[model samples]
Target: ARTKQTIHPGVTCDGCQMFPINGSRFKCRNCDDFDFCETCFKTKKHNTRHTFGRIN
Candidate 1:
């Protein structure tokens, strides 16, 4: 199962290279450490073939 409802404080969004996420955080369910910011969802930040799970 997923970790928690809130994001881990150490996670940073790789999309725009933003830290602390601040909004919704999306993580690749299969990849483990990759994270994406909320706005990045519209673009293909990662492989674009992987599925991302959401957290705040």
Candidate 2:
């Protein structure tokens, strides 16, 4: 059987503005098309209005 994939393909973290998002990523609930890497998410680098959801 084939395994399921969770991370969105070819998307980079909006917070860092670098590093392609893979394996696991964070998606912003309040913003449109905004994403963050683990470092950015854990550190809360994004704006306070944005809430994140795990995408993996």
Candidate 3:
């Protein structure tokens, strides 16, 4: 069986500083406390060297 993952509340997008409520957020595994929304992640608006994974 797969374990359920929970989302951390109040985690805003680092690029736009907007609350990620759309369930389309990404979190960087290479950086500490870094997050980005779908749009920002796709557009590469932030650092490209950081490794990111889906948050929601």
Candidate 4:
């Protein structure tokens, strides 16, 4: 079974820029970090992760 995970800064959706989505995947905006949610991260081809860290 798939395990539910938390929406950390590491886990972001490339498509919608939303975090903790079913499937989110992308690189870290602050550093060279990379991770994925579950759905969009793998199924969708969202290549770019939003640079939210820069906002704050």
For model 2, how does the per-residue alpha-carbon lDDT over 1-56 read when each residue is reduced to its tens digit? 75966556778888776556756788889888888888778875677766889878
Model 4, residue pairs in steric clash = 22-39, 23-38, 23-39, 23-40, 23-41, 24-37
Please report how far candidate 2 places residue 16 from its true position, in Å: 1.9
Candidates' TM-scores? 0.71, 0.68, 0.68, 0.29
Better of 2 and 4 by TM-score: 2
- After TM-score superposition, what is the CA distance of residue 10 in candidate 4 from its true location, in Å? 6.4
For model 1, the stretches where C-alpha displacement exceeds 4 angstroms are 1-8
Q: Give one digit per residue, the lDDT tens place, for model 1 in 1-56.
A: 85655545787878787777766888888786888888886675577578999876
Best by TM-score: 1
> Which rank order by lDDT, best down to worst?
2, 1, 3, 4
Candidate 3, which segments miss by more than 4 Å at Cα? 1-8
**Per-model tally of clashing residue pairs:** 0, 0, 0, 6
- Winner of 3 and 4 under TM-score: 3
How many residue pairs of model 1 clash at the backbone? 0
In candidate 1, the residue pairs with backbone N, CA or C atoms under 3 Å apart (3 or more residues apart, or in different chains) clash, namely: none
